[PDB]
Structures are given as C-alpha cells and as structure tokens.
Amino acid sequence: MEVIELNKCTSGQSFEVILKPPSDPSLEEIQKKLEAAEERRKYQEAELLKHLAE
Amino acid sequence: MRECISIHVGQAGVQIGNACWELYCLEHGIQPDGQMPSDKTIGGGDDSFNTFFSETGAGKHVPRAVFVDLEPTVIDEVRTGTYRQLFHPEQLITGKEDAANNYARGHYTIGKEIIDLVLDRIRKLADQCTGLQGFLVFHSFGGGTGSGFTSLLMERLSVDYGKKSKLEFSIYPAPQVSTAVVEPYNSILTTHTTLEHSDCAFMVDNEAIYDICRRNLDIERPTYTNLNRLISQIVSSITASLRFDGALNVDLTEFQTNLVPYPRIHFPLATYAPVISAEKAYHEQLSVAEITNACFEPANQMVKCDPRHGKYMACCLLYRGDVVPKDVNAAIATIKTKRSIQFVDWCPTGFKVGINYQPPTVVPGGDLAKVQRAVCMLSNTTAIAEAWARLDHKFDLMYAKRAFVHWYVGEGMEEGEFSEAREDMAALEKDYEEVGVD
Amino acid sequence: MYTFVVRDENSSVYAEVSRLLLATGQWKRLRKDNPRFNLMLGERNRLPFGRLGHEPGLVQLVNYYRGADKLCRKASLVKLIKTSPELSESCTWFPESYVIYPTTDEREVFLAAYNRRREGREGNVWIAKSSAGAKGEGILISSEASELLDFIDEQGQVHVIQKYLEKPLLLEPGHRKFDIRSWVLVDHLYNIYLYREGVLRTSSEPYNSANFQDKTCHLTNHCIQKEYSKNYGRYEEGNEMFFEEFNQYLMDALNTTLENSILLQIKHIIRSCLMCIEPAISTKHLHYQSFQLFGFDFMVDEELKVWLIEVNGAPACAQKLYAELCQGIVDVAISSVFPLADTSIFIKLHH
Amino acid sequence: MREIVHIQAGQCGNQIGAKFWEVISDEHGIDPTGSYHGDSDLQLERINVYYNEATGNKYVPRAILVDLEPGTMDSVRSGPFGQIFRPDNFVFGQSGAGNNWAKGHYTEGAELVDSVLDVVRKESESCDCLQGFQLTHSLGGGTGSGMGTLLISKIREEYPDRIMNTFSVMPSPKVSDTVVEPYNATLSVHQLVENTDETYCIDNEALYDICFRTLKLTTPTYGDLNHLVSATMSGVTTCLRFPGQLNADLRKLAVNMVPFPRLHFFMPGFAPTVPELTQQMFDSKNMMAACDPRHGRYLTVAAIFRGRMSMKEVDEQMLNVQNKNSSYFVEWIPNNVKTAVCDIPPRGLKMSATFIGNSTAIQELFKRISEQFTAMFRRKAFLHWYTGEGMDEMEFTEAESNMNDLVSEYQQYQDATA
Numbered sequence A: 001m002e003v004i005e006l007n008k009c010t011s012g013q014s015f016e017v018i019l020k021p022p023s024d025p026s027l028e029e030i031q032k033k034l035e036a037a038e039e040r041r042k043y044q045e046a047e048l049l050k051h052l053a054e
Numbered sequence B: 001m002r003e004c005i006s007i008h009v010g011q012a013g014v015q016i017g018n019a020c021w022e023l024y025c026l027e028h029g030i031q032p033d034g035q036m037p038s039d040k041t042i043g044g045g046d047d048s049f050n051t052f053f054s055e056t057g058a059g060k061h062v063p064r065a066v067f068v069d070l071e072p073t074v075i076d077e078v079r080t081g082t083y084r085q086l087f088h089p090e091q092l093i094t095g096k097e098d099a100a101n102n103y104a105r106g107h108y109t110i111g112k113e114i115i116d117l118v119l120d121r122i123r124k125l126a127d128q129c130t131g132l133q134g135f136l137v138f139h140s141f142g143g144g145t146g147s148g149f150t151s152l153l154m155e156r157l158s159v160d161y162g163k164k165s166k167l168e169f170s171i172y173p174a175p176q177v178s179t180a181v182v183e184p185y186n187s188i189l190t191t192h193t194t195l196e197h198s199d200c201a202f203m204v205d206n207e208a209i210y211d212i213c214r215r216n217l218d219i220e221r222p223t224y225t226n227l228n229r230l231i232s233q234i235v236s237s238i239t240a241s242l243r244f245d246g247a248l249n250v251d252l253t254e255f256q257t258n259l260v261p262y263p264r265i266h267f268p269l270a271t272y273a274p275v276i277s278a279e280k281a282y283h284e285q286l287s288v289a290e291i292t293n294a295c296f297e298p299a300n301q302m303v304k305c306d307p308r309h310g311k312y313m314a315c316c317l318l319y320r321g322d323v324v325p326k327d328v329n330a331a332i333a334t335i336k337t338k339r340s341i342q343f344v345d346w347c348p349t350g351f352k353v354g355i356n357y358q359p360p361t362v363v364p365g366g367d368l369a370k371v372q373r374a375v376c377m378l379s380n381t382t383a384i385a386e387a388w389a390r391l392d393h394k395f396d397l398m399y400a401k402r403a404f405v406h407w408y409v410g411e412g413m414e415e416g417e418f419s420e421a422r423e424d425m426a427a428l429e430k431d432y433e434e435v436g437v438d
Numbered sequence C: 001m002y003t004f005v006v007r008d009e010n011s012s013v014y015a016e017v018s019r020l021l022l023a024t025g026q027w028k029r030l031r032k033d034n035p036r037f038n039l040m041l042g043e044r045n046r047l048p049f050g051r052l053g054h055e056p057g058l059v060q061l062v063n064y065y066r067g068a069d070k071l072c073r074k075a076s077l078v079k080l081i082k083t084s085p086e087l088s089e090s091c092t093w094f095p096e097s098y099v100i101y102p103t104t105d106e107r108e109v110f111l112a113a114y115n116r117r118r119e120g121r122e123g124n125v126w127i128a129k130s131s132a133g134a135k136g137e138g139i140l141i142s143s144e145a146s147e148l149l150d151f152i153d154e155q156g157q158v159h160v161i162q163k164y165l166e167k168p169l170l171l172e173p174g175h176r177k178f179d180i181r182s183w184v185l186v187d188h189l190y191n192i193y194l195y196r197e198g199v200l201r202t203s204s205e206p207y208n209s210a211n212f213q214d215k216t217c218h219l220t221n222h223c224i225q226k227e228y229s230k231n232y233g234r235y236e237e238g239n240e241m242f243f244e245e246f247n248q249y250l251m252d253a254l255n256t257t258l259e260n261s262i263l264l265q266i267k268h269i270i271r272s273c274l275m276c277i278e279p280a281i282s283t284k285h286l287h288y289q290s291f292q293l294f295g296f297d298f299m300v301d302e303e304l305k306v307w308l309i310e311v312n313g314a315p316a317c318a319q320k321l322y323a324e325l326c327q328g329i330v331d332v333a334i335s336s337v338f339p340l341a342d343t344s345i346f347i348k349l350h351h
Numbered sequence D: 001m002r003e004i005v006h007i008q009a010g011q012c013g014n015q016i017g018a019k020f021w022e023v024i025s026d027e028h029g030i031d032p033t034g035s036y037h038g039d040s041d042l043q044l045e046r047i048n049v050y051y052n053e054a055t056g057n058k059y060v061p062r063a064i065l066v067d068l069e070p071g072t073m074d075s076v077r078s079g080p081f082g083q084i085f086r087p088d089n090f091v092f093g094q095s096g097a098g099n100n101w102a103k104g105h106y107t108e109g110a111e112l113v114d115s116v117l118d119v120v121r122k123e124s125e126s127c128d129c130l131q132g133f134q135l136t137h138s139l140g141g142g143t144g145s146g147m148g149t150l151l152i153s154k155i156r157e158e159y160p161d162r163i164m165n166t167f168s169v170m171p172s173p174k175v176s177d178t179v180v181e182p183y184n185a186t187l188s189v190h191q192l193v194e195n196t197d198e199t200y201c202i203d204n205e206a207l208y209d210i211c212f213r214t215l216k217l218t219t220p221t222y223g224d225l226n227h228l229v230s231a232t233m234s235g236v237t238t239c240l241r242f243p244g245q246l247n248a249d250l251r252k253l254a255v256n257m258v259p260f261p262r263l264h265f266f267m268p269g270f271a272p273t274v275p276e277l278t279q280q281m282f283d284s285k286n287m288m289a290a291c292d293p294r295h296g297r298y299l300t301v302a303a304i305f306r307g308r309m310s311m312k313e314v315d316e317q318m319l320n321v322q323n324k325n326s327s328y329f330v331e332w333i334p335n336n337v338k339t340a341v342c343d344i345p346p347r348g349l350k351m352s353a354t355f356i357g358n359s360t361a362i363q364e365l366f367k368r369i370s371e372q373f374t375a376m377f378r379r380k381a382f383l384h385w386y387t388g389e390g391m392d393e394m395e396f397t398e399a400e401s402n403m404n405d406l407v408s409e410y411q412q413y414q415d416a417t418a
Ligand SMILES: COc1cc(OC)c(Cl)c(-n2c(-c3ccccc3)cc(=O)c(C)c2-c2ccc(F)cc2)c1
Pocket: D175, D176, D177, D178, D204, D205, D206, D208, D209, D220, D221, D222, D223, D225
C-alpha cells in the first residue's frame, strides 16, 4: 500500500492510496430543429382551425 | 483563481440551490446581507472562496449563480427569503406558465422563447470572470423545465462556451414525492440530449434521500425542506474542494479526469456518512473507520444499488473535520478485506483522499446533528446502471401503448425522438455491462 | 393477504410451492410483470435484480441470490475455488480441475500435470464438462489428453477438465457407481439449512474401468440411466436410493454409519462454499431480501472420502420428497418473512 | 395570476354553478357582497385563479351565466350569493331550447352565442396568464347540452391553446324526465370527445341514492343533490385554489390524468379516521357516476385529502388499497395514483377526501346511451324535431359512430397486458 503525491496545506491534506496496480451540434443546427418543431405545431393548429372553419 | 457559475433550473434545481447557498454562506461566514467580516480584501480578491462568490466595492459577496424557472411561485420565495439581499435581480429569471411536466413543452415551445434571455444573463456573469472554469447545473429529471429547458441550455452552453466544463446535479425521480406520471419519459429524453454535453453528473434518487430521512432522522413524512437540507450537505462536500484550499479536485477538470475514464459513463455514485439526528442529545461519536465503512453500505448511498455486483473505475474520499491520513489508511486496509471491492482490470485499485479540517456545517434548527468528522465517497461504479434499468423499464411499459405521447407531439416533438432516446439508453445500459460484467 | 408472482413456469419445485401458497388462503397470485408483489419466484436467466426493493410499502422477497452463479457454473466454480484463500488452490475435497476455452485459460497448465503423472505412471483418466451440454451429452472421458483437447476445440463453449475419480465407492450387489445429491436452503438471514433427506442417484450397470466409450456405467444422471439401460429399476425404484437404506448398507457392509463416514464431510463442504460467498451475496442490509435452494452433487471414493462435483442453483427434487421439502421452503424461507394467521425437517449448519 | 374562466349554461348548469360559488366563496372567506372576512391568509394566495379583484378590495367571480330562458337566470340573482356576480355577465335569451339539442346548438343558441363570447373575451383580456375554461351543464337538455358544446367549439377557435374542463351531468340508467335525452346526450358526447381536455361525469340517480340511503334525506331534492356536486366540485379544485405543487394547474392535471386524448371522462367521488376515509372514497357507493369501478380498470387516479391529518398515515393507507387491489390498476402505467393534501378543510367537515378516477368502466355509460339512442334512431322517432331545425340524418349517424368508437377504445385498454 503506497501513499503517493501527499500535498499538505493549512486548510487540509490530500493524497492517493494505491492498493494494487492494474493488469457536438452547431448553433445553426439547433435553430433549425427548434424551427422544425414550431412548424409542426403550426401545421397541427392550422389543421384544427381548418376543421373548425368547416 | 478561476471562477465557477452555478445554474439552477426548475423548481427542484432552484430550491436545492437555495439550500446550498445558505449552507455555503454559513461555511464561509457570509451574512444574509452579503457582508463577510473575515474577508480582509474589500471589493476584490483571488481567494479560493471567491471562486463561488463575487465582491462589490461596498463589501457585499454575491453568489456566482443564476436561477431560472418558467413560473414565479418558486423564485419569488428567493426574492423574499432570508437571503433575498444576497442576490441582485438580474440573476433571477421567471416565466409565467410552466412546462406542465412536459419535456417537449419546456424544450421546444417555451425553451425557445426564453433561452436567449438566459444566455445573456449568464454572459453577464461570465464577463466578470478573469478565468471561467465551467458551470454547475442543478436540475431535476422529472420536471418539465428541469428536463426540457436544461437539456436545451446544455446544448447552447457547449456552443457559447465550447471548451468549458459542465457538471450536473440531477434529481432522479422517486414515486413517493413525484408530481407527474410521465417523469420516466422526461428522464430518458433529457438524459439522451444531455449525455454528450455533461462532463460529470452526480445523480440523486429521491427514494434514497427519502428513506435516509426516515431511517436516520426519524422523520415520519419527509418534505422537500428535509430532503434539500441533506442534499446540500452532499453538494457542499463535493464542491468544498473548489471553495477551500486544497490539491484534490480544485478544478472542474479534475472531476472528469479523476472520476470519468469513459466519457459516456460519467455518472458517479455518491455516498455520505454520518447522518445523525439532532434530537438525539448525544451519541457515541463515530470513528474514521466506522464512517468510512458506512460508505460501502447501500443504505447510505444516493442511489439504492449494489456495488458488489459491478466494478469500480475510480473512487474518491472527501473527509471534513478531525481526520488524519494514518487513520484513513488503516480504515481502507481493514475494509478491503471484509468488503467485495472489484476494480476494472484497466484501472489501479486506489483511492484518492481529500481532507478538510473544517467540520461539517449544519443549518440552525435543522434535523442534522453537528458532527466533528464526516465523509463523502464518490465512486464511479457500474452498479449505478441499475437506476437506468429501472427507469427504462417504466419507459417501456408506457411507450408500448404510446400513453401520454400525444402531449409531446402536440408540442412539436416527433415520436421518433422517443425511440431515438430510448435506443441511446439501451446502448448506455450495454456500455455499463461491458465494463462491469464478465 | 400477501402477493407473489411466478416467472419460471418450468420450475417443478416452485410449481408445487405456488400450489401450496394458494392453498394457504393468505396468498394471491398476480401476473408476470405486475410489480406490486411481496414474493417473486423469478426466472432462471437475466433475473432483474435491479428492479426489486423499489416498491414503496412492499417488503419484497426473491427466490434467488444475485451472484450465486459464481458457484453454480462449472467454469465459475473452478475459478472461485482456486482464487479464494478460504477454499485454497490446495483444496482437498474438490478434484484437480482446470478451465479451458475452445479456439484466463489454463490449457497449458493442465498438460503440465498430465505429463507429470504419466512420468510416474499414475492414472490419467480425465473428464471434460461444461454448462452448455445436457441430456447425458457434452461430456467425454479419456486417458489421453490429445483426445480431450481436440474434443474441446471441436466445441465453441468454455469447458473444464477435471481428474476423473478412478476408484469410486461401488455399491454391492451390482458393483456399480453412484453420486449423492443434497438439498440446501439459504434464507434471508443467510442461515444454511440442510435437508435431512438426501438421495443416491445410481448406475444400474457394473463399473467397467477398461472401456470409457461406454457412457452409462460412469454417468449417474437420472436421465441417461433411464434412457440407455434396461436394468434401470432392478435394485431400487428409479435408480434412487434413500439415506435410510444407504445407512443400513454402510453398517452391514462396512461397520460404519452414513453420519460419520460421509455426511459430516458433506456439511463441511456446504459450509465452506456458502460462507465463502456470503460477503458478496448476502442481503441482510439491502432493500430486497433473498433466499435460494441449492442442490449439491457429491462423489464418494473407496476410502470413504467425499468429493464435490458441481452445484445447481435451480435444481429439481425427487418425486418422493416434493411434498416435504416444498412445504419446508414455505415455513423457513417465505413464512419467515411474511407470517401467517394465528419437529423440523432441516439441519442448521452453524458458522 | 393563472386565471380560470367559469361558464354555466342551462337550467342544470346554472343551478350547480351557483352552489359551487357558494361553497368556495365560504372557503375563501368571501361574503355575498364580495368582501373578504376570513381568518387565514392562504385563502387569498391563489384567490385570483377564480376571482377578479375590483376597486375597493371586493372580489367578483370570473363567472359567466348563460341560458336561453330567463327563468333560472332570475333565480340565481335572488339566491344567497346572487348579488356577487358581475351583472353584465348574465347573458340570457327569452325563447328557451325546449330540450332540443339543435335549438341550443344551431338556431336559438346561435343568436346568443356571440353575446356570450363578448363577455368571455372581456374576462380573458383581464387575465395575467389565462389558464383555461370550466363549464357546468347537463347533456340531456337543449341549452346546456346543445348551446354548451357550441360555446366549447367557439372558445377553442379563439383560445386553441387553453385547457377546457367541463362538469357534465349525464343521463341516468333508470331515472329520466325527458324523452329525447338519448339524442341530446349522444350529440353532446360527440362534441366533448373532440373539444374537451377533462370531463367529470355526474349522474343524478347515483347522487339521489347517496342522498336517500347514506345521508338519510327522506325526500331529496335537486337542492340536496346540488350540495353534493358543489362539495365535490370544491374538492376537485382544491389543488387549483390553494397552494400546492401536485395538479396545481389545469394542464398539469390533464397531463397526469389523460394517457390518450379521447379517454378523458372521469368518475368523481367524495367522502365522508384516515383508514376510514380512504376506504370510502374508493367504494362504488361513493361514486357520482353510475359505473362500477370493479367492472373496469383505472388508467389513472387523483386523490385529494383536506384538513389536518398525518400524511404518514395517508401515504401508508393509499398504498395499501393500491397493493390490495392490484387487479384493478393498469400494469402498464406505473405509479398512476397521485395523492395531494391541503390543510384547509371544508365547512362542516374536518377531514375530506375527493376522488378523481379515469376508469374504463365508464364505457358502460356510453353503452347505455348508445343502446337507447339506436332504439330511437332506427325508427327515426322524434327526429322531425331536429331535422326541422336544419339538421341532417348523417349528423346523427356520425355522433353514434364516434361514441361506439369511444366504447371500443375503452375496452381496448381494459384488456391490455404488459
Ligand atoms: C332526472 O329525471 C328525473 C325524474 C323524476 O321522476 C321520474 C324526478 Cl322526481 C326527478 N327529480 C326532480 C324533478 C324533475 C323534473 C320534473 C319534476 C321533478 C326534482 C328533484 O329535486 C329530484 C331529486 C329528482 C330526482 C333525481 C334523480 C333521482 F334518482 C330521483 C329524483 C328527475
């Protein structure tokens, strides 16, 4: 069991204890997807108001 | 000195943040009006506690935090609370109608409306930063704003602040305090969208916090105040290394490099001890070995799972109070013989240990007892995937019938995003299984 | 009244336990994926342990121990015995064994011992087994290593090679082989209960040491004995000899008793195996509790030394004993957690 | 702040609506003159949801009163709280509807509908953030039945992104007072299936048996039945009128209750120890709709407890009923029973429990109505009264088919497994 890299200061104390060794989308893409979802909402609201006008 | 900005999203994120910052002030001796008598540098300083607090020429210490919810009932409590003085209004942001426990409503419909205003207020905090480490994002998986808007903000933050680190403090849903039937949907969707944008995410299952408050504090029916009080203690011990002098986890990047060797498996399991009731006038004070050994009992974990049936990829021990390294090494050596601790072959069987001589701080009148030594263990074990399995099963049962899906589609989302998000979690579950199983 | 769910319809043991619980009038059976249960009689592979113990207001119990697979599968058990201080690579009651993969592996070490004893002209009859084979197949006995190591690369699943017991205890009349099956119940407190009654699964053909091409004289499974032999049923009904008769034979033919010569070693082996894995499977501080019924298979040599050959996590009983054992499961493993309205058939092995 | 607009249409709707405002005005400490005289301050934290605040700190209900005949309109103004309503929000005709769904929907109600929407619009523009609408009415008449669903259709066209709730009195299995109710109900249900987010099913025969068997009212009256409905209507709106987080607005409630859009018809319940309350609310004898919950399965449930009580005891007792009767809860909607508690009790009671269930057993009601409707329509009995107002026969056929579809859908999920 080794105790390596012991750093020691006023507030506290840090160390390591080894026991055994081993063996993104762009901004344009974001706006486009948010717009496609706004379009889908507007088409559904259009189909609704269209059927209510009928 | 480098700065960190905390972002609190939704009801759960706001209220936990409101408890964390009350606890931060008590630890650093900051008064509700923002005055810190012990700060001998007025109007400035590059002290370690200044990583979370700004300073004004008048002597006030202002949290580097922004609070965002899509309805005012929660944030208006901050504007009137004991620490209303602490913040200034540009940090608090409100909508008028919430996301209705709907991930798509908070992500697409209402998220688009308010995202740009939030980034501007975030940008105001970043302009005051000489060197910005990254962000700490508090939110819930189940809420409409917590799941929907957070995952949108994470995407933009990866753009506006490309190379800066992001840490989540997420609230895994628990039925005993859950407000919505569709939380499993919101959790899978937000996890999928945020996975590639979060460098390290500490999950908290309200079931575990709820039972701990019942078992160890003898609270008949815990409330969010009870739960948040305890959550603040775990959050504080994790962020303590960023707010005090030290050499372990003094930079947001250290969390990833010390706890996350595999990018997608970035969900460490936190374990905290001792949780003692203050109504017990006195108890036999617990030894370092006893509290350290408590860290391997599932009853003290933030997510009820069985690490014995997984594999560790990293482990850190964060002590606060009367703890010396020789006591720790004795506790570790004796514990390793009685416990079933298995590491992955491609990692050393080690423990990174940090000690901070200041004993844990408790809120006056709270349910938690003042103790002289405490410990929090952050271990990246595959056993936390049990939580993903639980949540995925609930998702499958409802989606087999397309139950409630129309609420999401009516908000502009497509049924494909349900399958796309679910497949990602299916891969994540199998990623966890390659690492931790033979 | 309590609730339970059945998820392994093929379990003949828990089929009768299910019948018994409903006869109680205090247990209602729910359907497969109803999560609001007290007791899960779960499936045999990929049982979802991670979902148990998360239903508020429900003490949930399950009839399997997570992690028992390390003991109830040949490749796992060999690795467990060799790599545990408790059981010790220098173990006395487990035959010299080696794990070997077709096409972490131990093939090179198995040959080391094989030539080591053909140097000394000691017997070299080894056997290869695996959890993939069944129905009396997937098994080969030979004295030449080449015949066996070629036979494994002919397969695709991991196997284990084990030193065949060339000098077994042979029952007379018949001059025939046998193995012993003991049933063990481990409750949620991890109490180890041994069923008072065991069974000898018998070979009805005389043990021929010369020719191993013949299977039936060597393999004592209740399947191959019923299926490749006509003298099946001559000496005892169904090639099943029970302890009272076996106790008499030992006394009359060897001036000893079942208890002293054999049974005391069986209880030692059971304790050692289960107590070795208690830290890794015990559920006394978990959110869900466990119990499991195990079936231990033993071989006895002519010196009356007891050897362990395998363990079954999902075993079957003998037709004469289903009623007595399956009701004992209810009182000790189920009714212990979920009481009912208001002598013992088990041996408790202390630790 | 999140304001709801209330509408009551027809003789039935107005009578029920009037006692609803009597109950909650008392609960919020408002007297008939519109002035607050209460004790606690939780009474006013969410008062703006159902009340507008006007000069002089007087609170006026955000209520619109509608009927094609003036009779019941004059009774509302002479009642106990009739003084409180905004006099410009009384929108009444003179003809009446004569139990004719076509008159309320197409001819007599058409001439009056715009006058109603003008009041609706004026109220909605005075809302910080309008939340939705709730309507009280019957499905057997002509005004609340026919004109009510016209207002619903008109309101959706102006406020398509707002929630629409209704408290609908359904025809009863054995008690009726109008011959053509199968036609009026079937024509309204067709509308509600398409244009409402949440509908509470009330039938009078169940209310009457409660009044006669349980409360022991030897000669019950619509006065006694309405007191039950208003008490229930108070209970189902407690989470909307008092501080809380669970089902705190109409949309959040709908999202937790409606797994599939067309299956949004609920079976209310009320009761009357903690174990006693929880047993009652689940009992068939405490349901306000004539459907046995044991003849179907619950898709979702919402329970509201009021008064001072041990939440530990409540939480423990709700779980026992769920785990006791697992067969009656769908296995494929985990944790579909949600419980909320408010410290404010109703008047006369210290502990109350209100029950909201979305049970597939509701199909029985839609089958009763369909059977009666077809028996009339196959012979075209009484149809000349409707075709005489301009309707075509095919409007009837479509309404029948939609309800038969709605019955099929309810059965589909009643037998679904995991
Ligand atoms: C629904 O159709 C009805 C049919 C009927 O007689 C067959 C009656 Cl009496 C009533 N009814 C009336 C009433 C109505 C119209 C004309 C005259 C009297 C007034 C009243 O106060 C109450 C309580 C009831 C009522 C309700 C539900 C019941 F189960 C039993 C009685 C209603």
